[PDB]
Amino acid sequence: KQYIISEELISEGKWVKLEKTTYMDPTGKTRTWESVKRTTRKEQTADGVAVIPVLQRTLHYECIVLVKQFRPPMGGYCIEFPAGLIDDGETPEAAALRELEEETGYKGDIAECSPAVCMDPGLSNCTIHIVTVTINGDDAENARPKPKPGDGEFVEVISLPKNDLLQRLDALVAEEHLTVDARVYSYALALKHA
Amino acid sequence: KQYIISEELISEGKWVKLEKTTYMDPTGKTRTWESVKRTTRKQTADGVAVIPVLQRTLHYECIVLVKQFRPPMGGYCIEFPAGLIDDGETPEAAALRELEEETGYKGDIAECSPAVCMDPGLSNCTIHIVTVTINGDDAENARPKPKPGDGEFVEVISLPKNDLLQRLDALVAEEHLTVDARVYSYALALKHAN
Numbered sequence: 001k002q003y004i005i006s007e008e009l010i011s012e013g014k015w016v017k018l019e020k021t022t023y024m025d026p027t028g029k030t031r032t033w034e035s036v037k038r039t040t041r042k043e044q045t046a047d048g049v050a051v052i053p054v055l056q057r058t059l060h061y062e063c064i065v066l067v068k069q070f071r072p073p074m075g076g077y078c079i080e081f082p083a084g085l086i087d088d089g090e091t092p093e094a095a096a097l098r099e100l101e102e103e104t105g106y107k108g109d110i111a112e113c114s115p116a117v118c119m120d121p122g123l124s125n126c127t128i129h130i131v132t133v134t135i136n137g138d139d140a141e142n143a144r145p146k147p148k149p150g151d152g153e154f155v156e157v158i159s160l161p162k163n164d165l166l167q168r169l170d171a172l173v174a175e176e177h178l179t180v181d182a183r184v185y186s187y188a189l190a191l192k193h194a
Numbered sequence: 195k196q197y198i199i200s201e202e203l204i205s206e207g208k209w210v211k212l213e214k215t216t217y218m219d220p221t222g223k224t225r226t227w228e229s230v231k232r233t234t235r236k237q238t239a240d241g242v243a244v245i246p247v248l249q250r251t252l253h254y255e256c257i258v259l260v261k262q263f264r265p266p267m268g269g270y271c272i273e274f275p276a277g278l279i280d281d282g283e284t285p286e287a288a289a290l291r292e293l294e295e296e297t298g299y300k301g302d303i304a305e306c307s308p309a310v311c312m313d314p315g316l317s318n319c320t321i322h323i324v325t326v327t328i329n330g331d332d333a334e335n336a337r338p339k340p341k342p343g344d345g346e347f348v349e350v351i352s353l354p355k356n357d358l359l360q361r362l363d364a365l366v367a368e369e370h371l372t373v374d375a376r377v378y379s380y381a382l383a384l385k386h387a388n
């Protein structure tokens with residue numbers, strides 16, 4: 001029984017905007033909230049995709065393919081699933097395969113696509129689809145993968161074994177100032193907890 | 195070999211601000227990024243998110259989640275119990291406190307992540323992911339008393355760990371809720387550990 005009453009623009013950049021949200025609380029009292037949105041969302045069912053890329057190779061343990069890059073908002077390097085915004089008219093699956101090839105060089109196969117899931121719902125309306133993709137690392141096309149990074153894109157690939165992901169992430173965090181993404185960490189914790 | 199040169203305040207609310215970050219790209223070219231930050235960090239991270247593993251003998255292990263209206267999303271979200279870390283509170287103490295306020299359950303700390311980023315292309319927001327076990331057979335967890343702060347209105351949803359991804363997909367399809375990306379990532383890895 002809660003709902004939005006109004007959304008007032010506070011400040012609008014090229015990429016991000018701040019809004020004052022008025023909503024009805026369950027007691028029937030009007031309250032406000034400071035909300036972040038992207039300016040880039042048209043008809044996409046989500047802002048972006050994140051890819052869970054499972055690298056599969058005969059007589060190898062499965063690896064989870066990750067990317068390391070400088071994130072200006074963090075003032076530092078972050079370890080994340082490959083990810084990007086969905087272009088206008090692009091499907092989440094095409095966006096996922098495209099961003100995975102651009103960021104890692106690998107050509108994946110779709111396994112499954114989540115519904116739109118929320119990035120930080122107390123702060124922002126941002127959403128992604130989480131797209132699971134398998135990579136046949138025995139295919140010649142996946143032998144010597146070269147990232148195809150766009151303008152102002154500078155991405156390092158880190159493939160870690162699924163069977164040891166949390167400890168391998170911990171070893172990278174111990175050896176440097178970097179930040180692991182919360183989704184990557186959540187995924188690694190569940191692999192341990194299973 | 196990338197770094198921050200300057201941060202320009204664009205707009206400062208009570209809770210959130212928008213900044214224009216100037217940074218050095220790895221080619222030696224100066225570039226700008228629109229960044230979001232919270233105004234409330236004075237802590238290891240902005241917040242905590244709790245993975246609450248409800249353990250009851252002769253029952254399936256459950257993950258305890260919360261459903262709340264999220265003004266930025268304009269709708270109801272399913273999330274790990276979570277909130278901001280109080281000035282001079284430890285992440286572990288914030289985790290047990292928020293779990294009790296949001297669910298009424300009294301838990302034990304199992305493990306605590308390093309600070310992990312929420313949406314590092316958008317914001318500098320970080321949390322600690324705190325794994326907590328709940329002895330659902332203890333008298334203190336018989337009839338759990340959730341203590342909502344002013345303007346919090348939280349429903350508790352306990353789902354079985356070994357079916358988590360299927361149960362969340364079902365809630366999305368029937369209830370038109372948005373699942374949190376960390377919750378979804380956790381659920382995926384429980385299935386992928388196979």
Ligand SMILES: O=c1[nH]cnc2ccc(F)cc12
Pocket residue numbers: 032033034035122123209210
């Ligand atoms: O208006 C808000 N925006 C973002 N985070 C918030 C956290 C607490 C609060 F009461 C209000 C807000």
Ligand SMILES: O=c1[nH]cnc2ccc(F)cc12
Pocket residue numbers: 015016226227228229315316
């Ligand atoms: O300045 C940005 N802020 C947030 N997201 C962005 C996504 C792509 C881009 F080129 C620029 C931005």
Ligand SMILES: [Mg+2]
Pocket residue numbers: 082083084099103
């Ligand atoms: Mg990207």
Ligand SMILES: [Mg+2]
Pocket residue numbers: 083084099102103153
């Ligand atoms: Mg990209």
Ligand SMILES: [Mg+2]
Pocket residue numbers: 275276277296
């Ligand atoms: Mg909360």
Ligand SMILES: [Mg+2]
Pocket residue numbers: 277295343
């Ligand atoms: Mg509180």
